[PDB]
């Protein structure tokens with residue numbers, strides 16, 4: 001709730017443009033005073049967007065004290081532009097990384113999964129839902145540590161609804177806000193992410209999005225699998241099988257998944273990502 | 283399913299640009315052969331959109347034989363542009379109209395409601411849902427007749443989802459397709475539309491969309507009312523009250539609403555809209 005009505009250039013020095021997503025650009029910046037490096041996610045706004053509607057989402061991201069959640073430092077509104085300031089992760093997303101390094105090993109994937117689960121267990125304990133688990137939203141810093149990127153803010157500045165809000169029935173409004181989601185949907189997304197990291201794509205990546213969603217509603221839908229059976233351990237395959245449980249009633253929770261063989265095995269540490277980063281330099 | 287891979291300029295002559303919505307422009311055109319006038323809704327496409335995913339929606343709009351549903355004549359795909367060709371309504375939408383004429387009388391509103399209900403009863407009998415009932419989507423032709431504008435096509439070419447499809451759990455995919463909607467949500471939208479026609483705005487029009495939806499989820503939410511009590515009959519107020527029933531379980535169906543005093547009263551005919559159109563000329 002500390003949204004500063006200041007120019008973030010008073011506190012930070014912009015260094016370079018990391019890129020830009022569906023909305024907004026991301027900058028690498030340095031704090032004037034501490035010299036520390038931060039990430040600034042910028043989002044352009046109209047005189048139509050109201051900022052106070054975001055205050056609940058920014059509360060969510062601010063009151064998140066976990067090692068596997070990227071750190072929030074404040075927000076800045078200035079001249080119709082919104083800036084979210086966060087702890088900087090030098091290596092970027094797993095997707096930035098595997099697009100150069102090629103597929104991850106089972107050990108690297110296992111460690112990432114464990115770390116992601118740790119952050120999810122936390123989030124779900126605070127009754128929050130990430131909603132967008134995927135390789136592009138898992139950040140790696142230069143110490144090989146793993147951070148879930150920001151959530152719940154990007155999808156509310158979705159000027160797109162199947163309908164028009166002022167004319168929406170209450171039941172429609174409810175679904176348009178919640179998305180029918182539940183916490184265990186993060187667990188499914190994690191399973192797909194593990195395949196993504198293993199195969200450089202999520203399943204059905206070469207197929208139109210709408211068709212993919214259609215197919216998931218058919219009576220006899222079959223959850224995706226690892227393509228190459230021989231390449232991966234029985235434990236990995238089972239991890240995939242149980243995270244991609246079709247019914248959300250039978251799908252294991254984050255803390256339950258943390259007890260899984262694949263992520264509770266010894267020897268999982270950031271060293272695994274460190275030689276992944278070394279591979280980046282080769 | 284008769285989507286022509288031709289240039290619609292072979293069959294139709296473009297005359298003038300009626301305007302443009304969130305996506306695409308609308309043209310007034312003339313059929314070369316019959317001389318009849320049509321409306322052409324154009325929508326620009328990428329090499330990312332797949333046309334066959336639309337074939338189910340175009341089937342919906344094609345197999346609709348009702349007097350209160352705007353008539354579909356065919357589709358055209360050519361050079362990454364999609365054209366939907368429909369019966370032309372000369373006066374445009376009720377919104378195009380009331381923005382010049384000012385508020386509608388209770389009699390004009392009643393006749394519009396009846397006609398809209400007739401189209402809805404039909405749609406719901408074919409187990410279809412309009413999803414976007416509002417003044418901008420109720421068309422008036424030069425004979426004062428009433429036509430529901432196209433539906434289910436506009437909201438699927440919503441490249442916006444709270445999440446990423448390939449990583450979505452099945453339960454999430456289901457809600458992202460259906461929208462949790464049910465047919466009776468059209469009835470709510472009709473009620474809001476009746477206020478819109480009466481007051482030139484839907485309720486809470488000057489309030490941020492997200493806030494409006496939030497409010498509809500609160501324990502003690504109160505459905506909107508006609509602002510000026512004295513201006514409208516007891517029948518009109520009751521029509522508002524029952525269409526804006528909060529619980530979709532207690533909300534009346536289209537055919538039930540057709541038995542309502544306000545829309546079953548004698549003397550409701552297109553003559554009412556005809557002097558509305560005369561007012562347009564003054």
Ligand SMILES: CC(C)n1ncc2cnc(Nc3cc([C@@H]4CCNC4)nc(N4CCC(F)(F)C4)n3)cc21
Pocket residue numbers: 018019020021025026039041070086087088089090091092093096139149150
């Ligand atoms: C997701 C983003 C809003 N965000 N949030 C917190 C956060 C913390 N650190 C980074 N760090 C990085 C590092 C790198 C590495 C430099 C050399 N190439 C990769 N690239 C990127 N960008 C690649 C494409 C992008 F989405 F613009 C980001 N971000 C990004 C961060």
Ligand SMILES: CC(C)n1ncc2cnc(Nc3cc([C@@H]4CCNC4)nc(N4CCC(F)(F)C4)n3)cc21
Pocket residue numbers: 300301302303307308321323352368369370371372373374375378421431432
């Ligand atoms: C909703 C649209 C896709 N559609 N679908 C079927 C259809 C049949 N007839 C019209 N006719 C008209 C008439 C007029 C009147 C001329 C003089 N001004 C109003 N304006 C408009 N446009 C105003 C703003 C728009 F959305 F571009 C339309 N459309 C539009 C139609």
